[PDB]
Ligand binder design. Structure first.
Ligand code: LPU
Ligand code: ZN
Length: 140
């Protein structure tokens, strides 16, 4: 589990979005595994605006943050998980690392701020849904 809180937005994995998220929907994209809902309180997070390929991510199934190198966001085939069938996921970054389903929502961060959240795992990789292209998160 986990979210990003920027301005009056809450960014979660689409597959972990609650009824309250869907009832306060701003934007959602199944192909990216992202959903954004509206918040009452202002968020603590700063979104990275950059093309870094190194950062640190939180792994809840290890209670640990790991430094990783990761691929640039791309359209990638993802094998079936407990929460999606096998499918193509867009805006996905991969790194070598540990990820189980419940690790979804862990933050990946670089020197510029939050890059994305854990979205995929298995076969010794961790996949992250990028948010650095969602410029509208930073205003309004
Ligand atoms: C219905 S779901 O959550 O998308 N998911 C489909 C693939 C299966 O491996 C687990 C269940
Ligand atoms: Zn960066």
């Amino acid at each position: 589990s986990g979210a990003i809180y920027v301005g009056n937005y809450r960014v979660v994995n689409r597959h972990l979005a609650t009824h309250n998220d869907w009832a306060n929907l701003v934007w959602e994209d199944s192909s990216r595994d992202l959903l954004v809902s509206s918040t009452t309180a202002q968020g603590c997070d700063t979104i990275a605006r950059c093309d870094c390929q190194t950062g640190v991510y939180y792994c809840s199934s290890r209670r640990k943050h790991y430094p990783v190198s990761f691929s640039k966001p791309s359209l990638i085939f993802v094998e079936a998980s407990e929460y999606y069938p096998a499918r193509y996921q867009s805006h996905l970054m991969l790194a070598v690392g540990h990820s189980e389903p419940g690790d979804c929502g862990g933050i990946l961060r670089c020197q510029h701020g939050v890059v994305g959240i854990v979205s995929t795992g298995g076969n010794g990789l961790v996949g992250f849904a990028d948010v650095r292209d969602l410029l509208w998160l930073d205003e309004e």
